[PDB]
Amino acid sequence: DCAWHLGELVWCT
Amino acid sequence: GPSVFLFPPKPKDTLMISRTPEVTCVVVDVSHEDPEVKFNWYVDGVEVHNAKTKPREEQYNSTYRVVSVLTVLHQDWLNGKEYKCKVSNKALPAPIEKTISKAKGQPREPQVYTLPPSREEMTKNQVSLTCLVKGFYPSDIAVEWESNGQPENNYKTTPPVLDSDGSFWLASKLTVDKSRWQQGNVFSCSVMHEALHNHYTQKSLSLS
Amino acid sequence: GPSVFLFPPKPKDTLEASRTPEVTCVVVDVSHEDPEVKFNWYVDGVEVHNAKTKPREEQYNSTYRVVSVLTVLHQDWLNGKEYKCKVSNKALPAPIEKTISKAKGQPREPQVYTLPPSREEMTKNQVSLMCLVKGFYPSDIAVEWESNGQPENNYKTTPPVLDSDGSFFLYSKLTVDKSRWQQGNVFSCSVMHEALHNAYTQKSLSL
């Protein structure tokens, strides 16, 4: 899964 | 003679795969008579060659500022790699060397808790939403607030404080018109830190 | 030659009638060949002669550390008087002068709010009791904790942070064993500030 911040990509595992 | 200062990447750059972290080697007091500066860079002792020199900048005080920038991999930095800049110049009896890296030590996961305004604060024009972040290591972090996808910018966050167990804590306070709190708006604290899953967590807060 | 650093009194000393606040003039890099330091103090430019010199101290890096300490009255400090230390020594071309006073600007009363632990925290060995202090000016303040008249020492407090309205705020965090919290004990955050009533307030928190 993946994490976004205000539509911007943070990190995916 | 010239002096050197080496600076880490921004935490946010090392934690967002969409950004580009870099380390920066700044040479101040460069003479007009010997402006030529040579940089060697090393990573855990091994020379790398992909650095790039920024445009030369003359200063108010009749000396140059020269700057080398080295891009780095998110994971190298977060895995604690050591980056060394070595600076050579005719006005230097001997090259100068500086090194920097993440702080040493086992990383620990921040615990993130949101705290509503005190009942006593309920008489004011504005109220305080608190985000407590504790038990985290190393101290490199980013905290931001938002509601309905848009950034809420009217907040202030304390520097990290060293706690008694060797981890760090801080608090972030966001100030909103009481009526916005009363209208049931949901507010969210966003924390980014290496030892989080996908480097990111978000905790919400609304009128109960 | 020598270097001078002038230091304020502790906020707690100026805010408790019982303690003795003082202003401290530290001279470092005093040479072995010329250890004699002359101190002149002035209060709003008026020279005073009640300062006391501390015992001289060898640093073992070629130099002495020399300290003059000036007692000051609580209200002179709080009333914003300015204290000046002037240091003369044969290794200086000219005496060095430094000054210090309380920060300037309208004093403002701290707002003290206590925040219980989050429900999410209730699965841990220990919980966090928060004391939010905000809207205070100047930044000089002291925060402590207690319970059943007894001092609770397991806390950390952030430095004052400048807020968007020109006042400061801080947080203090007291960590207690969850069981103590669940059992109904009352914990108190005590704040000392110039702009408080009797320069003191205390706010209470319990399950």
Ligand SMILES: *[C@@H]1O[C@H](CO[C@@H]2O[C@@H](C)[C@@H](O)[C@@H](O)[C@@H]2O)[C@@H](O[C@@H]2O[C@H](CO)[C@@H](O[C@@H]3O[C@H](CO[C@H]4O[C@H](CO)[C@@H](O)[C@H](O)[C@@H]4O[C@@H]4O[C@H](CO)[C@@H](O[C@@H]5O[C@H](CO)[C@H](O)[C@H](O)[C@H]5O)[C@H](O)[C@H]4NC(C)=O)[C@@H](O)[C@H](O[C@H]4O[C@H](CO)[C@@H](O)[C@H](O)[C@@H]4O)[C@@H]3O)[C@H](O)[C@H]2NC(C)=O)[C@H](O)[C@H]1NC(C)=O
């Ligand atoms: C001739 O003049 C120059 C120029 O001076 C400037 O202009 C004049 C008119 C004055 O107004 C100055 O105040 C101006 O700076 C003099 O150059 C100065 O020399 C100083 C030492 O003599 C040096 O001090 C050291 O500063 C460190 C922090 O510097 C920061 O912050 C300051 C101010 O906040 C800023 O001016 C500096 O440029 C520097 O800023 C950082 O730059 C880095 C690298 O670019 C940034 O990081 C990067 O950012 C990018 C995106 O932007 C990206 O994220 C990258 O990944 C990332 O790497 C970083 O974000 C910037 N930070 C900020 C806050 O802006 C101190 O740490 C250092 O202290 C250490 O050493 C001390 C010993 O001296 C110890 O006491 C201490 O313990 C520390 O170990 C020093 O204080 C100044 O920085 C320097 N100014 C500049 C602009 O370079 C020059 O001295 C003078 N010569 C003579 C003979 O008079």
Ligand SMILES: *[C@@H]1O[C@H](CO[C@@H]2O[C@@H](C)[C@@H](O)[C@@H](O)[C@@H]2O)[C@@H](O[C@@H]2O[C@H](CO)[C@@H](O[C@@H]3O[C@H](CO[C@H]4O[C@H](CO)[C@@H](O)[C@H](O)[C@@H]4O[C@@H]4O[C@H](CO)[C@@H](O[C@@H]5O[C@H](CO)[C@H](O)[C@H](O)[C@H]5O)[C@H](O)[C@H]4NC(C)=O)[C@@H](O)[C@H](O[C@H]4O[C@H](CO)[C@@H](O)[C@H](O)[C@@H]4O)[C@@H]3O)[C@H](O)[C@H]2NC(C)=O)[C@H](O)[C@H]1NC(C)=O
């Ligand atoms: C020879 O050695 C000496 C001594 O140093 C020690 O021994 C050597 C061998 C080493 O082992 C050191 O590690 C040891 O410390 C060297 O002396 C040093 O010189 C420095 C100047 O070059 C000087 O730096 C300046 O420090 C200021 C802060 O000083 C504070 O905090 C430091 C450390 O955080 C602490 O060491 C100091 O003692 C001082 O602490 C405060 O003292 C005051 C005065 O007592 C206390 O206030 C009083 O407290 C009592 C209660 O007891 C009462 O309440 C009174 O009412 C109250 O007034 C206060 O509580 C103490 N605070 C703390 C935190 O402990 C900096 O602010 C300053 O920075 C400013 O200036 C810079 C430029 O100079 C600017 O860049 C900057 O922006 C600032 O404006 C300086 O950094 C060191 O303090 C000093 N060390 C000592 C012990 O004095 C000497 O350099 C060396 N010589 C040679 C040739 O090598």
